[PDB]
Amino acid sequence: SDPIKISIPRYVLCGQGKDAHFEFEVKITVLDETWTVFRRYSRFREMHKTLKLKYAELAALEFPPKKLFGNKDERVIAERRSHLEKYLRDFFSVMLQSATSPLHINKVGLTLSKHTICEFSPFFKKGVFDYS
């Protein structure tokens, strides 16, 4: 009844020195299949810019800006985690509603599986550190 579930349960520190940055643990579930990808903010933002020019309705979504107080402060990172989570959830909400989308709700007896999502955007494909 609710075909695509997503959460961001935690964020992890990657890299060493000043090249160290945060990635977000994205847990995705479609039907009864779950997998997890690690994605930094930049990758979310590029995903949004890329997909917005292909599906105009996404422009009604507010993407979270990166915040000028303290990239060093984990409280900032935690707020960002919450916001990215809400964003992904709304992203799929819109993509389930929009008729010209490959994700649209009319495929939910048919062709919507891990595969539809993974192909829909390289953002959701299992790459290196990602896992199922």
Residue numbers in the entry: 1181 to 1312
What text appears in the publication on this structure?
Despite relatively low overall sequence homology, PX domains all possess the same core fold, consisting of three antiparallel β-strands (β1-β3), followed by three α-helices (α1–α3).
We have also obtained two crystal structures of SGK3 and SNX23 (for which previous structures exist), as well as a crystal structure of SNX15, the crystal structure of SNX32 (in complex with a peptide from the bacterial IncE peptide) and the NMR structure of SNX25. PX domains are found in a wide variety of proteins with diverse functions, including cell signalling (e.g., PLD1 and 2, PIKC2α, β, and γ), vesicle trafficking (e.g., SNXs 1, 2, 3, 5, and 6), protein scaffolding (e.g., SH3PXD2A and B), and cytoskeletal transport (SNX23/KIF16B).
